[PDB]
Design an enzyme around this catalytic site. Structure first.
Site, PDB file in Angstrom:
ATOM      1  CG  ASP A 463      -1.972   1.099   1.169  1.00 22.47           C
ATOM      2  OD1 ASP A 463      -2.824   1.077   0.251  1.00 22.47           O
ATOM      3  OD2 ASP A 463      -1.953   1.979   2.059  1.00 22.47           O
ATOM      4  CD  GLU A 500      -2.579   1.844  -3.682  1.00 26.72           C
ATOM      5  OE1 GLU A 500      -2.247   2.167  -2.519  1.00 26.72           O
ATOM      6  OE2 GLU A 500      -3.697   2.120  -4.170  1.00 26.72           O
TER       7      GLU A 500
END
Ligand SMILES: [Ca+2]
Ligand SMILES: [Ca+2]
Lengths: 874, 101
Positions: A463, A500
């Site tokens: 993340d 990400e």
């Protein structure tokens, strides 16, 4: 009250940096106060030490500026050798110069003197148990021992500090105790020394809501399920990273609405361990088709959900169903209880090493450790490797207060990233971590090894990887790969990493160091999400105007009334989007050569997005994560129901959903699917369903509902889009029936099988793709809304390339988004022995069956809103 | 001379429209700094001599010869009037925000 700001930096043990006047730097004194008694009455009073800081002419040396580039022009001040640095970092500190008073940011000097590489947490010996805590700014560290998770204190033991490390060795009988640390340390946010009760950063287990740390040996026999040590032999075969497909699922969603599972197991780790539940049969069907990996949303200890299940609130699921499909009454009932419900994604990290207590049958005891290991084992046995969503970018809470603050409580202002004024950065969400600091870097790698060794996890999704240093990403990669079966029980060469790679905020353009952005992560072998192909298919972007059309939403072919320019403008935009998809279909490579819509032959990197950056940014196809939907934003079904013409039938949109999914499954690189894409999942057009409860996040494995039309989504996140949601929700023709859902699933299963029927869809290197992959419908003369992809293999007498496919010699895929049938004529594919793929010949859909090929002109007749696969048998 | 579709895309700064709502009205998607970055990148992609024009289209929009507005504009939101949204929209180029000429 004395509440100073922190504009000065202590970078090394003899150097302080501060951006003051070249002349006012001749009157700078360093103040220290252990009991933090400093105040203003009008100079400074209540200090222990006062020492002159001598300004340096040269400035800050290179070794300092290379670690902290954002303060490279700062003035340098020398700290005299008489000063005891180790004792002063434990005090309240200010530098004062008319009168300019500020505090010091310490991480720099803490990494210089107190960088530690030895044991931390709990170490188990044959006769002894020893604890270790890193707290170089602490005035004292004690350990409170507890008999259970509720009783009073048994004992209190002092710890001895050595090089910033507090340690204590006790007897063997210490095992299975519950403990807390007692830390008295200066907190700059409260401007005083507080005695804080804190949990262990290197905790392996916790009681309910992380109230106490459980002193447990993770190697214990009583924590291993049957044949756990022989799991490496049971794990599904992985020949290469090119064979990976990913399925993104949230633990609670999986079994919250599953009646076949017991209510005590619903929405937890036990659900995956069931024999023949609806959910496990669903995952079995996809796995047999070709699915390899399951990505689960945050499973570690996060805040936002109470572990004690008795506190959980619920919505009246009977009376809520009697409301209109486009009402605002459903969200009002959920919002009223959303803070004390059982639902959250889990993006509020507290402790990274402990499984979440709420997903366990009992928050107290060995329950959470065993049931996690059972979940991994069960998925491996049905042929699915397990990927963990790891959130190292930020923390839930900060400061000396609260049950949800751990790291920032022990060492204040070190684990968190701060600006030039000393305020905490909130760009990730809240309380951003600082992976550039040595001990944060170590904590992240030690965690990734914890889940790999103790829990046998097969991969990790990062993340906000762009908020983590590349340095940390590369060291973690080498550590995970070096793991062997004979030494640690897990083959580390099969572990895959991705995340990400968004580049933004105070970490953008390498402002805090080389960060893990998509562009910087090129050639590393670590995957990143292809947001170029995502936006080119759906249209616009997740934060743009909701009605912006794209390739698979009828940009030019089927206008939705929203003004996007004239006919010539939309047609040129459609051909542009097609060029971006084709690069992604070829593995989003830097060096792949494609003829763009103008006729010009361009390399992947030379083709840019409409707002700056290059489309193709990878050196290897395994660095590409192709997707059209995830947990973030709106689901595939929801976005297609908004963007595409409102007059359409649900059967037509069902076919469009299949197109987007198939484009991912048939692409070079690694396909990524959101759970429910197979069964037309809806969230009732909710774009941020992280806190929307079970109501909007429902996954139905009875296939009766897709959760479309359950009221307007929560206001705070969606209120402004209510007028364009309501009429679509209120219209019955928008809601699909049981027959639609099952047909979409069966069509999904078929495509996966096609991908794994040929190694040509999964080419491992960049040079293989260049030579073999060819696109045909190109130039100014191309048929709009049609992508033709052909993969070549070694054929005939003495071929140029090696043979990879034993059954086929050539594969051609035609993507058609037009409302009508298309007749293609490709001269390069003429006089060839093509036929329709055996999977599509026996397909349950009658529409696909009409696909045909002619050897004369090289004619490809492909039905409307259809993807067809053609093959040439050997 | 700054024509939408020629010098800069149609619906020039659609991401900035959502960012204005999050900042002024207090409603929109999470991770507001990620939304900000795309808005600033959309603004920086516009040529220097057309940036003020593309910023006006976000605020007021282009009216067709037919009579109606298409590529804008800043409308009315619940407890968030037009003029309140407009005032912040002009400060997007300033040093405190995207920092662009
Ligand atoms: Ca499988
Ligand atoms: Ca909640």
């Amino acid at each position: 009250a004395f509440m100073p700001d922190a504009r000065a930096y202590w970078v090394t043990s003899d150097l302080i940096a501060w951006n003051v006047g070249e002349l006012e730097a001749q009157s700078v004194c360093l103040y220290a106060s252990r009991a933090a008694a400093m105040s203003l009455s009008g100079g400074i009073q209540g200090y222990d030490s006062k020492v002159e800081l001598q300004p340096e002419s040269a400035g800050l040396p290179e070794t300092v500026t290379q670690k902290f580039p954002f303060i490279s022009s700062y003035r340098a001040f020398r700290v005299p050798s008489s000063v005891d640095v180790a004792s002063l970092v434990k005090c309240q500190l200010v530098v004062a110069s008319h009168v300019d008073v500020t505090g010091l940011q310490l991480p720099g000097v803490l990494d210089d003197m107190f960088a530690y590489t030895g044991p931390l947490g709990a170490v188990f010996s044959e006769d002894s148990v020893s604890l270790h805590l890193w707290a170089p700014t602490a005035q004292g560290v004690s350990v409170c021992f507890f008999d259970g998770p509720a009783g009073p204190a048994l004992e209190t033991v002092q710890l001895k500090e050595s090089n910033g490390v507090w340690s204590v060795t006790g007897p063997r009988e210490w095992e299975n105790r519950y403990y807390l640390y007692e830390v008295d340390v200066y907190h700059p946010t409260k401007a005083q020394v507080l005695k804080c009760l804190a949990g262990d950063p290197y905790a392996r287990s916790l009681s309910a809501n992380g109230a106490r740390t459980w002193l447990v040996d993770i190697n214990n026999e009583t924590l291993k399920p049957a044949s756990w040590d022989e799991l490496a032999d049971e794990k599904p075969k992985l020949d290469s990273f090119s064979d990976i497909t990913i399925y993104e699922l949230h633990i609670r969603d999986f079994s919250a609405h599953d009646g076949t599972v017991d209510s005590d197991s619903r929405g937890g780790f036990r659900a995956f361990a069931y024999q023949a539940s609806a959910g496990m049969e669903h995952l079995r069907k996809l796995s047999d088709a070709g699915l390899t990996h399951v990505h689960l949303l945050p499973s570690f200890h996060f805040a936002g959900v109470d572990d004690i299940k008795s506190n959980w609130k619920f919505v009246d699921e009977c009376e809520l169903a009697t409301f209109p499909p486009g009402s605002d009454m459903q969200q009002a009932a959920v919002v009223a209880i959303q803070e004390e419900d059982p639902y959250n994604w889990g993006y509020n990290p507290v402790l990274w090493g402990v499984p979440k207590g709420s997903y366990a049958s009992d928050p107290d005891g060995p329950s959470r450790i065993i049931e996690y290991r059972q979940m991994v084992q069960a998925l491996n046995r049905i042929g699915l490797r397990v990927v963990m969503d790891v959130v190292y970018n930020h923390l839930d809470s900060s400061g000396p207060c609260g049950i949800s603050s751990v790291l920032d409580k022990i060492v204040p202002g070190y684990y968190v990233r701060r600006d030039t004024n000393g305020q905490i950065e909130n760009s990730a969400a809240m309380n951003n971590t600082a992976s550039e600091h040595f001990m944060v870097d170590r904590l992240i790698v030690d965690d990734l090894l914890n889940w790999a060794v103790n829990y046998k996890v097969d991969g990790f999704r990062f993340d906000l990887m762009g908020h983590i240093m590349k340095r940390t990403m590369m060291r973690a990669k080498s550590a995970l790969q070096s793991l062997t079966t004979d030494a640690h029980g897990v083959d580390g060469s099969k572990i895959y990493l991705y995340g990400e790679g968004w580049d933004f905020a105070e970490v953008a353009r390498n402002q805090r160091g080389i960060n893990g952005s998509q562009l910087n992560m090129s050639g590393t072998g670590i995957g990143s999400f292809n947001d170029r192909i995502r936006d080119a298919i759906n249209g616009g972007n997740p934060f743009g105007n909701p009605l912006q059309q794209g390739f698979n939403t009828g940009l030019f072919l089927e206008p939705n009334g929203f003004y996007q320019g004239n006919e010539a403008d939309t047609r040129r935009s459609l051909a542009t989007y097609a060029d971006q998809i084709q690069i992604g279909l070829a593995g989003n490579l830097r060096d792949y050569v494609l003829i763009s819509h103008t006729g010009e032959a361009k390399k992947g990197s030379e083709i840019h997005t409409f707002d700056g950056l290059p489309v193709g940014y990878t050196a290897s196809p395994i660095e590409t994560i192709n997707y059209v939907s995830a947990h973030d934003n709106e689901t595939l079904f929801d976005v297609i129901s908004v963007k595409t013409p409102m007059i359409l039938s649900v059967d037509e949109r069902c076919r469009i959903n299949h197109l987007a999914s198939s484009m991912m499954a048939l692409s070079q690189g690694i396909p990524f699917f959101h759970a429910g894409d197979e069964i037309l999942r809806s969230k009732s057009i909710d774009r941020d369903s992280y806190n929307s409860g079970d109501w909007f996040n429902k996954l139905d494995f009875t296939y009766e509902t897709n959760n479309w039309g359950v009221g307007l989504p929560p206001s705070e996140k969606n209120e402004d889009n209510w007028p364009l949601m309501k009429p679509r929700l209120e219209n019955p023709s928008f809601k699909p029936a049981k027959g639609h859902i099952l047909a979409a699933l069966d069509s999904f299963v078929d495509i996966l099988k096609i991908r794994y029927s040929s190694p040509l869809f999964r080419l491992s290197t960049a040079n293989d793709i260049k030579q073999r992959v060819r696109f045909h419908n190109t130039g100014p003369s191309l048929v709009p809304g049609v992508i033709v992809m052909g993969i070549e293999d070694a054929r005939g007498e003495s071929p140029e390339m090696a043979q990879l496919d034993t059954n086929f010699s050539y594969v051609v895929t035609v993507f058609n988004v037009c409302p009508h049938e298309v007749s293609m004529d490709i001269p390069a594919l003429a006089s060839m022995g093509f036929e329709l793929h055996p999977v599509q010949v026996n397909s349950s859909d009658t529409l696909v069956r009409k696909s045909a090929y002619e050897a004369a002109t090289g004619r490809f007749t492909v039905p409307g809103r259809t993807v067809s696969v053609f093959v040439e048998p050997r | 001379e700054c024509q939408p579709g020629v010098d800069f895309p149609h619906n020039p700064l659609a991401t900035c429209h959502t960012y204005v709502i999050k900042r002024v009205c207090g409603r929109g998607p999470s991770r507001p700094m990620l939304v900000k970055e795309r808005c600033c990148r959309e603004l920086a992609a516009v040529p220097d001599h057309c940036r003020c024009e593309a910023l006006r289209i976000l605020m007021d929009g282009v009216r067709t010869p037919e009579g109606r507005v298409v590529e804008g504009r800043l409308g009315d939101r619940r407890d968030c009037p037009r003029e309140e949204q407009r005032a912040f929209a002009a400060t997007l180029v300033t040093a405190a925000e995207c920092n662009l000429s």
